Short mmCIF file of C-alpha atoms and ligand atoms in Angstrom, two decimals:
data_model
loop_
_atom_site.label_atom_id
_atom_site.label_comp_id
_atom_site.label_asym_id
_atom_site.label_seq_id
_atom_site.Cartn_x
_atom_site.Cartn_y
_atom_site.Cartn_z
CA UNK A 3 0.00 0.00 0.00
CA UNK A 4 1.45 3.41 -1.12
CA UNK A 5 2.33 6.12 1.47
CA UNK A 6 -0.51 8.48 0.25
CA UNK A 7 -3.04 5.58 0.69
CA UNK A 8 -1.62 4.72 4.17
CA UNK A 9 -1.69 8.44 5.24
CA UNK A 10 -5.28 8.84 3.89
CA UNK A 11 -6.33 5.71 5.93
CA UNK A 12 -4.87 7.51 9.04
CA UNK A 13 -6.91 10.62 7.96
CA UNK A 14 -10.06 8.44 7.49
CA UNK A 15 -9.47 6.98 11.01
CA UNK A 16 -9.26 10.52 12.51
CA UNK A 17 -12.46 11.51 10.64
CA UNK A 18 -14.26 8.38 12.04
CA UNK A 19 -13.07 9.37 15.57
CA UNK A 20 -14.23 13.04 15.18
CA UNK A 21 -17.72 11.69 14.16
CA UNK A 22 -17.77 9.01 16.97
CA UNK A 23 -20.02 9.09 20.11
CA UNK A 24 -16.83 9.58 22.23
CA UNK A 25 -16.57 13.29 21.08
CA UNK A 26 -20.28 13.94 20.25
CA UNK A 27 -20.85 16.31 23.27
CA UNK A 28 -18.55 18.93 21.56
CA UNK A 29 -18.31 17.65 17.92
CA UNK A 30 -22.06 17.99 17.04
CA UNK A 31 -21.95 21.67 15.81
CA UNK A 32 -19.40 20.47 13.15
CA UNK A 33 -21.44 17.42 11.89
CA UNK A 34 -23.37 19.31 9.14
CA UNK A 35 -22.99 22.62 7.23
CA UNK A 36 -23.88 25.74 9.28
CA UNK A 37 -27.55 26.45 8.39
CA UNK A 38 -27.12 30.24 8.77
CA UNK A 39 -30.81 31.00 7.90
CA UNK A 40 -32.09 28.40 10.50
CA UNK A 41 -29.70 29.76 13.22
CA UNK A 42 -30.45 33.46 12.30
CA UNK A 43 -26.75 34.04 11.43
CA UNK A 44 -27.66 36.33 8.47
CA UNK A 45 -24.02 37.66 8.30
CA UNK A 46 -22.40 34.14 8.33
CA UNK A 47 -21.85 33.89 4.49
CA UNK A 48 -20.59 37.53 4.33
CA UNK A 49 -17.85 36.64 6.91
CA UNK A 50 -17.14 32.94 5.98
CA UNK A 51 -16.18 32.72 2.25
CA UNK A 52 -15.45 28.91 2.43
CA UNK A 53 -17.86 26.95 4.68
CA UNK A 54 -16.62 23.52 5.84
CA UNK A 55 -18.02 20.76 8.11
CA UNK A 56 -17.35 17.06 8.84
CA UNK A 57 -20.19 15.80 6.53
CA UNK A 58 -18.47 17.67 3.61
CA UNK A 59 -15.06 16.18 4.67
CA UNK A 60 -16.68 12.66 4.84
CA UNK A 61 -18.23 13.10 1.32
CA UNK A 62 -14.85 14.33 -0.08
CA UNK A 63 -13.07 11.32 1.58
CA UNK A 64 -15.70 8.81 0.25
CA UNK A 65 -15.45 10.44 -3.25
CA UNK A 66 -11.57 10.12 -3.23
CA UNK A 67 -11.50 13.95 -3.52
CA UNK A 68 -8.49 14.26 -1.11
CA UNK A 69 -5.20 13.41 -2.89
CA UNK A 70 -3.07 13.63 0.33
CA UNK A 71 -3.31 14.03 4.14
CA UNK A 72 -2.37 17.79 3.84
CA UNK A 73 -5.49 18.46 1.67
CA UNK A 74 -7.68 16.62 4.24
CA UNK A 75 -6.05 18.56 7.15
CA UNK A 76 -6.61 21.91 5.35
CA UNK A 77 -10.41 21.28 5.21
CA UNK A 78 -10.61 20.17 8.89
CA UNK A 79 -8.56 23.26 9.94
CA UNK A 80 -10.69 25.50 7.62
CA UNK A 81 -13.78 24.23 9.58
CA UNK A 82 -12.13 25.27 12.95
CA UNK A 83 -10.81 28.61 11.52
CA UNK A 84 -14.35 29.50 10.25
CA UNK A 85 -15.61 28.94 13.84
CA UNK A 86 -12.80 31.20 15.32
CA UNK A 87 -13.36 33.90 12.62
CA UNK A 88 -17.20 34.13 13.04
CA UNK A 89 -17.51 33.68 16.85
CA UNK A 90 -16.36 35.81 19.81
CA UNK A 91 -13.66 33.68 21.54
CA UNK A 92 -15.68 33.27 24.83
CA UNK A 93 -18.71 31.60 23.06
CA UNK A 94 -19.66 27.92 23.78
CA UNK A 95 -19.21 26.84 20.11
CA UNK A 96 -15.55 28.11 20.25
CA UNK A 97 -14.80 26.01 23.42
CA UNK A 98 -16.30 23.00 21.54
CA UNK A 99 -14.12 23.77 18.44
CA UNK A 100 -10.94 24.09 20.65
CA UNK A 101 -11.66 20.65 22.24
CA UNK A 102 -12.39 18.90 18.89
CA UNK A 103 -9.29 20.57 17.31
CA UNK A 104 -7.18 19.19 20.26
CA UNK A 105 -8.42 15.63 19.33
CA UNK A 106 -7.63 16.32 15.64
CA UNK A 107 -4.15 17.92 16.07
CA UNK A 108 -2.78 15.30 18.57
CA UNK A 109 -3.91 12.35 16.38
CA UNK A 110 -2.94 14.06 13.03
CA UNK A 111 0.60 14.40 14.60
CA UNK A 112 0.76 10.53 14.81
CA UNK A 113 0.59 10.35 10.94
CA UNK A 114 2.58 7.28 9.72
CA UNK A 115 5.81 8.29 7.82
C1 UL8 B 201 -21.34 35.21 16.68
C2 UL8 B 201 -22.40 34.59 17.53
N1 UL8 B 201 -22.59 33.16 17.24
C3 UL8 B 201 -23.80 32.60 17.14
O1 UL8 B 201 -24.83 33.26 17.27
C4 UL8 B 201 -23.86 31.12 16.87
C5 UL8 B 201 -24.97 30.46 17.39
C6 UL8 B 201 -25.14 29.11 17.20
C7 UL8 B 201 -24.19 28.39 16.49
O2 UL8 B 201 -24.28 27.03 16.25
C8 UL8 B 201 -25.23 26.25 17.01
C9 UL8 B 201 -25.33 24.93 16.28
C10 UL8 B 201 -24.78 26.06 18.44
C11 UL8 B 201 -25.68 26.15 19.49
C12 UL8 B 201 -25.27 25.97 20.79
C13 UL8 B 201 -23.95 25.68 21.07
C14 UL8 B 201 -23.04 25.58 20.03
C15 UL8 B 201 -23.45 25.76 18.73
C16 UL8 B 201 -23.07 29.02 15.94
C17 UL8 B 201 -22.03 28.29 15.20
C18 UL8 B 201 -21.95 26.97 14.82
N2 UL8 B 201 -20.76 26.85 14.21
C19 UL8 B 201 -20.18 25.66 13.61
N3 UL8 B 201 -20.11 28.04 14.18
N4 UL8 B 201 -20.88 28.91 14.79
C20 UL8 B 201 -22.92 30.40 16.15
#
């Protein structure tokens, strides 16, 4: 198995973990695209040029869209950055993002070489 395949299986494992019951208490705001209209965030799409969420990452992984781990990481980090850009840093969703990003970053660091 090639290194890109092996690294994308590590990425797929991380993605499975981020969507797992273990992290659900803080991962759930990142499961589906932000429904700005439903949440009354009528400025969301003016501020966030590139929306990203774990369902979109899962679809891109299933569709073999990601060519390497770096591409996968960039979407997961884009999702967190969107949260930090839109939200005051003392808001509950930001605490949830920080916790889920901690799970992501520590396991992404264990990438097989
Ligand atoms: C700048 C002020 N921010 C918001 O008004 C706001 C409100 C709700 C959000 O999402 C719902 C799913 C939520 C609810 C409770 C706890 C946590 C989240 C969000 C939101 C969701 N995401 C991914 N980013 N912001 C922002």
